[PDB]
Amino acid sequence: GSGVGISTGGWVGGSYFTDSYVITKNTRQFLVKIQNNHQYKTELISPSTSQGKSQRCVSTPWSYFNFNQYSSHFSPQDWQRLTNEYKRFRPKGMHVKIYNLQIKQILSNGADTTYNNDLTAGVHIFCDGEHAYPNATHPWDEDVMPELPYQTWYLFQYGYIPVIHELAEMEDSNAVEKAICLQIPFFMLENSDHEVLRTGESTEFTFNFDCEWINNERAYIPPGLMFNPLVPTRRAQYIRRNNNPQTAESTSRIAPYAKPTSWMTGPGLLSAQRVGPATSDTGAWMVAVKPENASIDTGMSGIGSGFDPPQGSLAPTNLEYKIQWYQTPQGTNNNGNIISNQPLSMLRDQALFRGNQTTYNLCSDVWMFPNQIWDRYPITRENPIWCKKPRSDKHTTIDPFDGSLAMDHPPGTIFIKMAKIPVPSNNNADSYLNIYCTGQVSCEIVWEVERYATKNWRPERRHTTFGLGIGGADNLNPTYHVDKNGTYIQPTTWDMCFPVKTNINKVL
Amino acid sequence: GSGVGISTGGWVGGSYFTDSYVITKNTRQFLVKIQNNHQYKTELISPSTSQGKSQRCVSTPWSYFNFNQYSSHFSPQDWQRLTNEYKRFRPKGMHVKIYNLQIKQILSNGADTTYNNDLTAGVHIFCDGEHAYPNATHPWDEDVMPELPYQTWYLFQYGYIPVIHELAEMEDSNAVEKAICLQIPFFMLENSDHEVLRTGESTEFTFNFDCEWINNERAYIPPGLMFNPLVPTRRAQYIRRNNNPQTAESTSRIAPYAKPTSWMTGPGLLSAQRVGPATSDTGAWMVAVKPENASIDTGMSGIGSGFDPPQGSLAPTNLEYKIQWYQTPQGTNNNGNIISNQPLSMLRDQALFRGNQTTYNLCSDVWMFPNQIWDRYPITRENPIWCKKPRSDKHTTIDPFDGSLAMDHPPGTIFIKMAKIPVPSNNNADSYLNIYCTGQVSCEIVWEVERYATKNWRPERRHTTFGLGIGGADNLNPTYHVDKNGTYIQPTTWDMCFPVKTNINKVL
Amino acid sequence: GSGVGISTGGWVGGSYF
């Protein structure tokens, strides 16, 4: 059948797990709220603390689906079934279905509320196959899908930064900031066509990934530690005159153990320190722009973006480089707040010393160098799956230090809006009918997956629940589980979330 | 046709009765209430009386259909048509249909209520073919289908015990109860996919049974009483010196009557007595666990489950072993309260004596023994049809003492939920739209049935209404019948409900 | 070949899964 009163599609989920691939299926309940009236504005965000960056941005009536995270697509068991049982995996494809839509027509008699349901109403649904438009999705952000099904999924408003607020602020003069103010592009999702849906209708979307593997594997030794220490080496060490304390120059054969190596450590930036008060964008490395004239307020600050984490690789000094996240919107300064940790993988730590003719002294920087090896960030269940690689003429190796992934075309963000229904007036307008939509997204994605075999004699390592710990309310219930009170207990610190790359082994 | 305004299926019922099989058909009106918001929690049930067991359990938004009982599928005449006319029967198959759904959208203006009906709403319906998930159905419980049609059927919330509350309580220390607390599984019905239904849609489910016959038959003599008492026997009795009072040892031939037998009595446990106050789970036999360390509060109690009835077989001493049930939720301590009784079948009673060299003394226990014969509990119209045999490596004969049946895969429990419809807010959430579902289940099950023939000359026995008695309001109306006032009069004590195994006969 | 000086079979192991 078809029409109102006939559901379009059913609920879906439960994953799969075949040796060659893993099919994860998920379904949600969402609602679209009519953000920002239906008009756009700009909003010039800022806190005040007027010294802040005060990015101008743009607001839109649209809301969007963010599917990017692992904890959305994998249950704590599905994750840890692949983290234990497979070398590597990458998402092969993605299939999304909007269906079972509802338009409920908010009413207010004062106080209270009433919902009359509705028919003869519509919902705009738009997808990016070209990745035109500023593509809201940023790897970390918030939201994505609730890691836990049955939990309704509130969409978030779509917005974008047209241009840096400073540089076009603009200060008196200028014509250097007059341009870059004149050139700010203005994007609208109306433009390119898109589907409207009443209740009985649904929509599907597919995606394919040109995508790099993410490897769950562990190097038990540094790459420079690979050699037979029993066998002597043919090589020699000349050592300069020490010039205090003592021990004039001599040449000698390199010991059989501790043979020299190629294979430099991976790059990192360790020298900087985060600058100034919070909410001011303290990154310790600001990329900025600095056009030749322009004009600039206090800052630095205040222009450009903080680079985080430096690192990458190159084991950090203190917590300041160690990433962090709250895994919860209610998270206060210290609460939630699980902090990244070392995988104990040997790749992946990578100091560098140089110096002194007397002592070794850990060195800041370590830029790119020909023989370098590093290991991509071990990630974890809480991480974003992908990140969009911005289109540009030239680029280097492209390894994001957030883990995640880089793709020319990631999954196109699916945008959805409430289809303004106006109402007559004398003035006339601006007035509209207050409605919201509700429905079910099913994100079914296929994962290219590869299973591990090794010649190691020893048991290696897995992810037990014993890394997990008890929490919530009265302490009862362990970790991934409901409260009484039921509130899903969040995993506390890093090992709870079970990172890949801490298990198996690989001969380098 | 199709869609709203076209009923999906019609009412069904009236049974069948062919010699080879009996088809019982039933239809109901049910409603799903949105239990437990849509969140799960845990609920740590307990009374207080904090000394109680205080099982933690888990609550779910789901409700389920329990079809397990005889009085649901058989009218008092349909039952007693098979109990009189057939040796044995077992359910062959089962066919269930949800249809004629309605979502009525509860409203409250304060006091009162209003129901706007609704469209563009949905209902989740999920079935277990694999019997993954904890499967709420327990043989006795409550509810099932109302034995009487036209009586609306209120569903009950689905919940399960993740782990024994004690042992993980946990007391200080521990790491023995830390494990078993960490390992508590958490099941969710979202997971595996399931169908959502608007009004116009329906759903069917089928089931097949690998199932043991339940026998309606009567042994007119004990199995050890089978012999020709006229014919002399070749056998002898040596009797030890009596050592007080008198009568020194002698050997003699066994009398022609009262020949010795094989065929030991069925097993039972008669020694124990129920322990302590009610609501504390007094079973007289507690299975428990007792891990080697753990920790334990007062109890025993308090851990594990009471084994009921011991018995089995092995005619009990007092009422304490005799089972009982109230056949009514309104039943107080003594009200309703029909108590099981002896079938007068001879199988099926089974004392055991041993002792003393002087006197025989009824013996407690009687575990399993090679030659034992017992007769499965005679059941009655009020009993559960089946019980799930839990998956385990090893097990013994598997005869449940509740009567009923054991199956690897019983009928998969059908789960149903109200499909949370959220509503927008600032906070935002947690908020949802208040609705309920209403519809018709038709459970049509086929019974493999076998008809009796015998060489007995005499009339045997049947189930008359004369076993029944008058009751309700002013005494008028007999037993299975409406009051004035109309309330279905319940059968009082055991013979009213007409048990199988009290009729026909069988030569052993 | 066959006879002394020709090994009959080789070493084996390593499981499968």
Curated annotation (Swiss-Prot), chain C:
Lineage: superkingdom: Viruses
Family affiliation: Belongs to the parvoviridae capsid protein family.
Residues of the whole record sequence present: 163 to 179 of 670
Function: Capsid proteins self-assembles to form an icosahedral capsid with a T=1 symmetry, about 26 nm in diameter, and consisting of 60 copies of three size variants of the capsid proteins, VP1, and VP3, which differ by the presence of an N-terminal extension in the minor protein VP1. The capsid has a channel at the 5-fold axis and there are densities extending the 5-fold axis into the interior of the capsid. The capsid encapsulates the genomic ssDNA.
Name under which the protein is recorded: Minor capsid protein VP1
Organism: Human bocavirus 4 (HBoV4)
Record comment regarding domains: The N-terminus of Isoform Minor capsid protein VP1, VP1u, contains a phospholipase A2-like region. VP1u may play a role in the disruption of host tight junctions in the airway tract.
